Amino acid sequence: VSKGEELFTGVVPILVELDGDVNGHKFSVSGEGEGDATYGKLTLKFICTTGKLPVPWPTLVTTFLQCFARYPDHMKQHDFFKSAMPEGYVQERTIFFKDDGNYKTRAEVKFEGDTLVNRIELKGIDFKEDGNILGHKLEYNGYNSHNVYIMADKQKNGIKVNFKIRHNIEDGSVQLADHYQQNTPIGDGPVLLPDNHYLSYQSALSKDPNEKRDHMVLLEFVTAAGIT
């Protein structure tokens, strides 16, 4: 196994800490769980520690650990995420909500000992007061996409990722969220610059029946594909 790959052969504990500000509405979220890349499995629970989350949990699903994706053996050489570990990488995204505002996120993903940690800062601007986001008009469910596109970015020694999410609006319509992403390694060591490929997602949202705080239980299965 590769140096980076070896860090993911078993169950890895995860910690996520996010500070956000959407149209001046400030909030913080703490998350805990575990990743089992062998099965492309993520099991997580996020808690808003500042009170009520000012945006719908579904809009934060993509922000809330691609290093846990299951890369088929024949595609191992295209797994940028694990190759950058343990020093990690910085993930940046601009998420454009159609006919509404946008989120810009900066996440530092790396190991703190044997724990995979993600420190995230989220900034949202230009949102409409009674739009689907600030007006909480989105159904509490996930989105499953087979089109999370990955390609190399030799200029930052990393990758570029793009994909679309369609959140379900309570009236039966959909709220599009266009994602543009870039990942840059934190260390100066070699990383695997991948050939074009994609990740396939299965995402499910739920609630902890005994939890009184505003929270989200998230289960995902992530698999790389596209290179035969």
Side-chain angles (χ1 to χ4, degrees), residues 164-177:
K164 293 168 177 280
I165 297 296
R166 296 178 178 81
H167 301 295
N168 300 301
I169 302 170
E170 294 176 313
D171 66 359
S173 189
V174 286
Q175 169 66 69
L176 175 65

Side-chain angles (χ1 to χ4, degrees), residues 172-186:
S173 189
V174 286
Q175 169 66 69
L176 175 65
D178 278 303
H179 289 62
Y180 295 87
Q181 172 190 331
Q182 79 194 342
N183 295 63
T184 305
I186 287 176

Side-chain angles (χ1 to χ4, degrees), residues 137-200:
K137 308 184 184 183
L138 302 181
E139 296 177 348
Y140 189 73
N141 43 50
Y143 186 79
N144 285 13
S145 151
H146 293 272
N147 307 125
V148 173
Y149 302 111
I150 299 178
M151 63 178 51
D153 181 357
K154 335 167 285 186
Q155 326 195 149
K156 280 291 281 311
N157 186 45
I159 58 170
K160 300 268 272 150
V161 183
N162 73 93
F163 56 102
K164 293 168 177 280
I165 297 296
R166 296 178 178 81
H167 301 295
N168 300 301
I169 302 170
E170 294 176 313
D171 66 359
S173 189
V174 286
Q175 169 66 69
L176 175 65
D178 278 303
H179 289 62
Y180 295 87
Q181 172 190 331
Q182 79 194 342
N183 295 63
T184 305
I186 287 176
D188 199 38
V191 298
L192 294 172
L193 297 175
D195 276 18
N196 292 4
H197 68 282
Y198 65 90
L199 300 183
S200 180

